[PDB]
Design a protein around this ligand. Structure first.
Ligand SMILES: OC[C@H]1O[C@@](CO)(O[C@H]2O[C@H](CO)[C@@H](O)[C@H](O)[C@H]2O)[C@@H](O)[C@@H]1O
Ligand SMILES: [Mg+2]
Length: 580
DNA sequence: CTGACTCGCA
DNA sequence: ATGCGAGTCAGGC
């Protein structure tokens, strides 16, 4: 049966109570400079729907929106906050965000709309957004009658669900995680997204020019070596040319056919000259289509800025994700790709890019959580952890560690953090499973505390049904009891990795909140631009670099206190590339 | 429109 | 071995 509400033609005082469920609807997935199609408010006085032209033009309403003492409960308040920023309107006083609450209670649910969150509490008097708006090509805002009832039902749901969600969060000891970490961070991400990052489009276009020429050369060279033309981008056509036409050996298969992944090609390289060209082609083509053309597609023509959207409620570990564009995977490892960063510049004249990154935060977190004496001492001495690991597992002095030994000790450390497995390590190191197992065994002999932790955390995941992070984020692992070896092992690796990756996420998130409070107290113009898992990227006047050099690392290093120190490196320059 | 396969990042 | 997003090709509606 329909839900009662007032389809208001003008704003009234009772619509401005100091407590309400608020819905500021933005249907476009990318909410930057997007339309607000309707507004719903549910409070002690009733349910109301307001047309955006009316509400957002009303001084009383706008003032109410910006009054921190007028508390609002919402779902994805960041979306509304940013769409409002583009309209020059400030949203304050959001005390409860149902999206973030749902995400903390169970990130596996994949809650993406009010209906999904409401179902967690057997509340179903609200439709999924997709049912109301449609899929993609068929997506669209419905007529006012249907739209208004949908927004009211969502507001009503939020109004009703706040208490039960807060109660369960309290029981989980996650109440502060929502109120003191995720919600305040939400506002910071909103500012970051709205500010955006300036892009030197001319530079990108220059690079695209050079790429197009080089790509054309390697392309012809490839057909020349294949004795014909084909679509190199087709793992299907390619596999036929390599494994059938040229008779190259098949060392690995995908699931649908031949495997042409870079790791396998590298092994075929010594057989035919075409392999190196295909790898080079893969490289250039990746940069051209994803980082040159792809980036250019989302730069705002007017401001020449890209405005990413940080999905704060998606990952199973507590990390953020970045989209349109993804600014968390801009090339850096290989020089050619690294040059892409020269295109990310400060938004104002005489400003510089400042980047600060935690040094080995995951292994430092592991040292803290496992309380491994050897690992803790290593970081207390600020030793090169990979060289040290090599010394221990290979039983040699620092002078006897060869480049290859460190490389393998490094790979072992990656495995330990990801959830060790002989098969996985063997694959990565291109060695036998028995050999990989021997490495792992030697590792545990040198770091018995880590061995104890891995055994204990898996036992705990089984007993409790989930694992937690330093700040009480949690992840349920039902597969941990599966009788299927593969499924169970995947869950065991997650039990081992999540607390490490997740705790690192908690720490940097708190560093971001602490940093912003510090920047405000100091009245610095510096502001965050991006976060890339273990690093923070800022931009500021050149006159503020010396202050930032001391302030940023300190705040990041002091975000939390562990049994081992946290170490932060930093650099700054004219472009993101130069902030090295 | 959607699942594969690929590769960029931490 | 953790796990994110985007571009490509492919088959399919
Ligand atoms: O606004 C981001 C927020 O919205 C969700 C759905 O509630 O994701 C939507 O928006 C993202 C950014 O535009 C898209 O990537 C996603 O496809 C779309 O459903 C949440 O996942 C997210 O926290
Ligand atoms: Mg680092």
């Amino acid at each position: 049966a329909a839900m009662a509400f007032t389809l208001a033609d003008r704003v009234t005082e009772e619509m401005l109570a100091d407590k309400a469920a608020l819905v500021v609807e933005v249907v476009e997935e990318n909410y930057h400079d997007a339309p607000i199609v309707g507004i719903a408010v549910v409070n002690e006085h009733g349910r109301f729907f307001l047309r955006p032209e009316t509400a957002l033009a009303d001084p009383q309403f706008v003032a109410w929106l910006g009054d921190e003492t007028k508390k609002k409960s919402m779902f994805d308040s960041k979306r509304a906050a940013v769409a409002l920023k583009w309209k020059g309107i400030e949203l304050c006083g959001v005390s409860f965000d149902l999206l973030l609450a749902a995400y903390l209670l169970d990130p596996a649910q994949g809650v993406d709309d009010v209906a999904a969150a409401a179902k967690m509490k057997q509340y179903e008097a609200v439709r999924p957004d997709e049912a109301v708006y449609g899929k993609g090509a068929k997506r669209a805002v419905p007529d006012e009658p249907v739209l208004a009832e949908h927004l009211v039902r969502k507001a009503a749901a939020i109004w009703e669900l706040e208490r039960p969600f807060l109660d369960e969060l309290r029981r989980n000891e996650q109440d502060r995680l929502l109120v003191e970490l995720e919600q305040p961070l939400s506002s910071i991400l909103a500012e970051m997204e709205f500010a955006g990052v300036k892009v030197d489009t001319k530079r990108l276009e220059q690079m695209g020019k050079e790429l197009a020429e080089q790509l054309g050369t390697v392309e012809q060279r490839i057909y020349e070596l294949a004795g014909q033309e084909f679509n190199i981008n087709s793992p299907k056509q390619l596999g036929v040319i390599l494994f059938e036409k040229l008779q190259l050996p098949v060392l690995k298969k995908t699931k649908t056919g031949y495997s042409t992944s870079a790791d396998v090609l590298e092994k075929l390289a010594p057989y035919h000259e075409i392999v190196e060209n295909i790898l080079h082609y893969r490289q250039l083509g990746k940069l051209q289509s994803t980082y040159i053309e792809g980036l250019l597609k989302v730069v705002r023509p007017d401001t020449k800025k890209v405005h990413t959207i940080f999905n704060q409620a998606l990952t199973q570990t507590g990390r953020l994700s970045s989209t349109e564009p993804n600014l968390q995977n801009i090339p850096i490892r290989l020089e050619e790709g690294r040059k892409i960063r020269q295109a990310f510049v400060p938004s104002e004249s005489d400003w510089l890019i400042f980047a600060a990154d935690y040094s080995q935060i995951e292994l430092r977190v592991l040292a803290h959580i496992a309380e491994d004496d050897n690992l803790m001492e290593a970081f207390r001495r600020d030793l090169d952890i990979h060289t040290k690991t090599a010394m221990d597992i290979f039983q040699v002095s620092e002078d006897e560690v060869t480049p290859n030994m460190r490389r393998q000790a490094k790979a072992v450390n990656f495995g330990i953090v990801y959830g060790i497995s002989d098969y996985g390590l063997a694959q990565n190191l291109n060695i036998s499973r028995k050999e990989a197992a021997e490495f792992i065994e030697r590792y545990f002999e040198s770091f018995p505390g880590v061995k104890r932790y891995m055994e204990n955390i898996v036992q705990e995941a089984k007993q409790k049904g989930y694992v937690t992070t330093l700040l009480h984020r949690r992840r349920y692992l039902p597969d941990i009891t599966s009788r299927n070896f593969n499924v169970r092992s995947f869950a065991e690796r997650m039990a081992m990795n999540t607390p490490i990756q997740g705790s690192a996420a908690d720490i940097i998130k708190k560093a971001m909140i602490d940093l912003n409070a510090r920047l405000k107290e100091e009245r610095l113009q510096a502001h965050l631009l991006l976060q890339v898992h273990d690093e923070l990227i800022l931009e500021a006047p050149k006159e503020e670099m010396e202050r930032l050099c001391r302030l940023v690392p300190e705040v990041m290093e002091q975000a939390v206190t562990l049994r081992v120190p946290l170490k932060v490196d930093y650099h700054y320059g004219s472009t993101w590339y130069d902030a090295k």
